[PDB]
Design a protein around this ligand. Sequence first.
Ligand SMILES: NC[C@@H](NC(=O)c1ccc(-c2ccc(Cl)c(F)c2)[nH]1)c1ncc(CO)s1
Lengths: 556, 412
Amino acid sequence: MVPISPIETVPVKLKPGMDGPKVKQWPLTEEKIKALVEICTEMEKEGKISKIGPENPYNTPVFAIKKKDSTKWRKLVDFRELNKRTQDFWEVQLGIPHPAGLKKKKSVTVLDVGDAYFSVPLDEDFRKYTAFTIPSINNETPGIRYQYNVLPQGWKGSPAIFQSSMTKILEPFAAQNPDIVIYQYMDDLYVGSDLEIGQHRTKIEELRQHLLRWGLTTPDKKHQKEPPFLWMGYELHPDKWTVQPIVLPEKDSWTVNDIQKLVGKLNWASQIYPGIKVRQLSKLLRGTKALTEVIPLTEEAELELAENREILKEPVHGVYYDPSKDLIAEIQKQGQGQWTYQIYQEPFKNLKTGKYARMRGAHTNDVKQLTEAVQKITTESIVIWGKTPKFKLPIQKETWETWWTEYWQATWIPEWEFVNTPPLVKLWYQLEKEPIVGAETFYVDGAANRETKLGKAGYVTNKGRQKVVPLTNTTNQKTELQAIYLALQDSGLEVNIVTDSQYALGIIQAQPDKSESELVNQIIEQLIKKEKVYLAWVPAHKGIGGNEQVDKLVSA
Amino acid sequence: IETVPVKLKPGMDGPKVKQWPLTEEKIKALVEICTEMEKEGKISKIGPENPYNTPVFAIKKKDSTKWRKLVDFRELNKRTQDFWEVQLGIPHPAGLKKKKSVTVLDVGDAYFSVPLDEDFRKYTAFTIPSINNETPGIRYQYNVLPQGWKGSPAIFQSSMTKILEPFKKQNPDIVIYQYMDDLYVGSDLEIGQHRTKIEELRQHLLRWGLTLWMGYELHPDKWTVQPIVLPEKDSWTVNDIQKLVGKLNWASQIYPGIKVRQLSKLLRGTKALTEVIPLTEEAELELAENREILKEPVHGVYYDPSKDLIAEIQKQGQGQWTYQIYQEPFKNLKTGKYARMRGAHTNDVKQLTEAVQKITTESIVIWGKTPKFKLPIQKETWETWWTEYWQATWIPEWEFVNTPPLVKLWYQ
Ligand SMILES: NC[C@@H](NC(=O)c1ccc(-c2ccc(Cl)c(F)c2)[nH]1)c1ncc(CO)s1
C-alpha cells in the first residue's frame, strides 16, 4: 500500500455558553428504519461513522427520504439544533464568480467533489456532538448509536472546513503548475489551460493522483457533463456565455409572488441583454407588503412588459475577459431615472451589461444619477476584473467641468470620454453668482396658516410691479415656493429674486432638473427659459424691505 | 519578551467586518508584503474556525513609491479594552500644540518586535481578496503588535519610554508625543535647529534596533484660530447689505450682542439689488459695534474630553476648503482653511481626502483624539475612492452631508 497523507484537523468548539444538542429521535416507520441501518452499516464499514456507547448524551434526529425516481433510500441527518450550538466559521461564501470575468482559456475541465467531503476528517473533540440514534423496530431495543468521524452532511462548518482543506492541498500543485489556472467554488473544481488538450488532460491526471495522496477521490472516466455547462442560471460555452433561458410568467391578474418572480426573472436578463427596464413593475411592490395581494398592471407597465417580451427574443451572449485589452464601460440615459450600461473590450461584443435605477430621492438631477451609475459600474468592475473600466459617457467635457467646479459637494468620476449618442446629460440651468444689473428685482414671500391651511404668495419689485395671490390647502413651505414661481412667471429673461425661504434655497441649490413636487417642476421649467437668474437669500422677520412690505402683504 | 494580557470588553465579540473589493495591483502588492511578513513570523495563515475579519488595503506613503499595507483597525479599536491598568493612558501634552514646530515620525516599524498575546491574535484576522471571487481569500492573523491597533502604542508605552528617557532628559525643552504609530516631536527652536534635534532622534532610534527616514513638518505656531470679518467698503449696494445682515444674523448665534436693526432699516423697501445705498449714521454705528464684538473670542468655549469632536468641511471652490471643529454647535474649538497645489486641481476627492488628513493631524496634536467628520460628499462617491488617496496609518470616523448649507458663504 502507498500511504495516504492525513488531512490536518480544523479545531471546532461550541458557542460561548452553550450545551450540546438533546433532541428526541422521531418515530420512524418500519421500512425507513431498515434503510438507515443498511446505509449506516456500509458507512461504518468505510471509517465514516462509528457506533458510540451509552455515555454520549447528545442526539440529532435523522430521517430517510426516497431518492425519487429510484428505489434507493436517501439518508439525512438534521443538524439544525447542533448548528445552533456550533461556533461561527469564516465564510468565503460572499461571492459567486461572474462568467464575464473568466479568462478565455483554450481547454477547460470541471470536476465535482460531491464525494471527498466524507473523506475530510472531523475534529475528534467535535465528533461526540454529531451523535444520532437509529431507532429500533417496535422500540423493543435501544436505538443504535453513532457519531460522525468525517464532515457530516448539512453541517455549519462542513463547507468551510472542506474548502480550506482543499485549498491547502491545492497550493503546491498550482504553485508548480503555473501554466494552468485552478478556481475553487462550490464543491466544484475549475481547471483550465491554454495547453493543447493532450497536455491539458495530462495535468488533469497528475492532479487526480496528487489528490489521491491525501485521500480524495476523482471522477477518472470522462465526466458525463463537459463544457458547455448550464451553471447557476447561466450558459457557459467555449467562446461565449449567456443567461440560462428564462421566460416570464403570464398572469391575467398579477399577485405579489408573481411580480417578484417577474422583476427577479428580469433583473437576471439585464446582465447581458442590453436595455432591460423594471420600473413600472417595482412601484407596484414597494407600495405593498402582502405575498398574495393582487395589483392590476399600470398603463405604463403593460407597454413595458411588452418591451421585456421584446428584448428576450433573440440570443445575446457575453464573451470572456481578455486581460491584454482595455476595459470599456458605456452608459445611456434611458429615461425616468433608469440607466443602462454595456461593459466591453471590442465594439459590439459585450462582456456583460446592466441597468441602474435612481435612488428614491425627493429631488434629483441627471448628472448625480450618471455619477452614481459610474460608481456602481466601478465597484462592480473592481469586483469582476480587478480594475476600473475606461468610461464613455453621454456628457460633454465642458458640462462635467461646469458641474463639478460649481457643485457644493466634492465629486469625481474616473477617466472617461464623451460619447455623442443622445440623449445627452446636460445642465438645464445655472444660477448667477452676482446680482444682474438692469434686471428687475423681485422681493418674494409666502405664508400659510397652519390651522385653516389658507395662505398667500407673491412679490413686489423695484419697478413697482406687485402681485399677491391667495391659496387654499397649503403650507408655509408650499407658499415660499409659489412666491418664487410667480416671480419667474412674470419676469423678463433676466431676473434677480430675493427670498427668505431657507427651504427654497436648499432645493434650488441642490440644482435638481426633475422633482416629485410638480410645483418644483414648474420652477425648474421657468428657470430653464430664463437667460440669467440671481437668487439671493435674506433672513426672515428682519423686515428686509422686499420681505417686509411683502411680509406685511402675504400675511395680511 | 512576554505578552501582556488583553481582553475585549464584556458582551462584545471580535470584529467581523467585510473586506471590500481591491484592484488587481493592490492584491498583487498585498500578497508579496504578506509573504514576507509570513517568513518573518509577523503573520501566520489561519483557518475557517476563525470567524473574525478586519479589512485591509494598500497605499503608497508620501514621497515614497513602495506599496504599504494598511489595516483599517477601526472596529477592533472600538471593541478593544482601553488600557487603564497601570497608568490611565498617556495624558495629552497640552504643550505640544504651543510649539513653533512639530515633526511627525513613523515609529510603527518598532511595533513588530513585540509579541502579541496568543489569546488575542484570533481577533486581528484579515483577508487578501481574490478577483472575481475565484480562489478563496488568503487569511492571516497577527503575531506581533499590529500597526493601526490602539493597543500597540498602549502596550509599547512603557517600552517606548526606556528608549526616550535618554532624549527627554537631554532636551527637556522638547515635547514628544505618540498617537498610534506616529511620534510627534515639538520644539520652540529655530527650524534649522529643530531639524537637527530631529535627526538626533533618527539615529537614537537606530541604536535600539540593534538589540522611518523622512520628515513631515507641521507648524502649530504658524497657525491659530479664525475670526469672522465683515467687508469694508466706501459704498454699499442693496445686495452688499443683504449679505452683511445675513452674515451678522448668522454670527449672532455665536457672539451674543450682534445687532442688525439699523442695517436692516436700510433694507426697507424694494430697491434694485445693484443699487448703492448710503449708510445711515445709526447703521455705520451698528456696524462698527459689531466689528468690535467679533474681535473678542467666544466666552466659555471649553473643551470637554467626555464629548465627541465633530469636524465639518465645506468646499469653497478653486481648491479652497474650510473647516470647523467643535463639540457643541457654535462653540468652535478650532477653525481653519486648507488650500490647493497638492495633486488637487482636477480631483475634489483627493482634495477632500487630504483635507480630512490634515484636520485629523491638527486634531491629534490639539487633543490626542480624532474627530467625527461631516463630509460634503455622497457616501457612494466617498466610499469608492477615499482609499486611493489615503496616506495616514489611522482613520477617523465620518458621516455624510446631503443638504447644501447656507453657511458656505459665511465661512468664505
Ligand atoms: N459538473 C457539474 C458541476 N459543476 C458545474 O456545473 C459548473 C459549471 C460552471 C462551473 C464553474 C464556473 C466558474 C467557476 Cl470559478 C467555478 F468554480 C465553477 N461549475 C455541478 N453544477 C451544479 C451541480 C448540482 O448537481 S453539479
